[PDB]
């Protein structure tokens, strides 16, 4: 499970993850504090022990590893991705590979969060070498966006490698 939108993900107690804010669709530091899927077992004992699905197909409850104030917030397997630790170099940036990446939507020349995109185009010049991605927010999505921070694109992580 490497590039080309491998589409993986399986997280656990204190397995470091990135997570999407449902409000701007951004990816940031999130430490896992509970993996479970809300079935009180099967038919409601006051316990909430059992998970109906596999450790991949369940629910994840993060504590934002940079933002401790915003507390325990719950996201699903598709809307969390593990802590994207391995850099995608310039040469591996596949057109149509979904990545999470250095962009700010308020100032697109600047650094903000790791917004989720797919490579839409690649180009290089005498002075500058660039990426162009379809960027996705938690509402809208901005096509052929000027990717300035080339050195810190991240991909979908493993489930458990």
């Amino acid at each position: 499970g490497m590039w080309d939108e491998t589409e993986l993900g399986l997280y656990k107690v204190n397995e470091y993850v990135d997570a999407r804010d449902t409000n701007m669709g951004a990816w940031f530091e999130a430490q896992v504090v509970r993996v479970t899927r809300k079935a009180p077992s099967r038919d409601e004992p006051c316990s909430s022990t059992s998970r109906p699905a596999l450790e991949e197909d369940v629910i994840y409850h993060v504590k934002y590893d940079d933002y401790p104030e915003n507390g325990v917030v719950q996201m699903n397997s598709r809307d969390v991705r593990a802590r994207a630790r391995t850099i995608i170099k310039w040469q591996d940036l596949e057109v149509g590979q979904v990545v999470m990446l250095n962009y700010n939507p308020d100032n697109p020349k600047e650094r903000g969060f790791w917004y989720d995109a797919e490579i839409s185009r690649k180009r290089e010049t005498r002075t500058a070498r660039e990426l162009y991605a379809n960027v996705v927010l938690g509402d809208d999505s901005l096509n052929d966006c000027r990717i300035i921070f080339v050195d810190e694109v991240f991909k979908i992580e493993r489930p458990g490698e």
Partner: peptide, 11 residues
């Protein structure tokens, strides 16, 4: 370059 900072919330 090779570094990861966060900024702002809409939350």
């Amino acid at each position: 370059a090779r570094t990861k900072q966060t900024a702002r919330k809409s939350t």
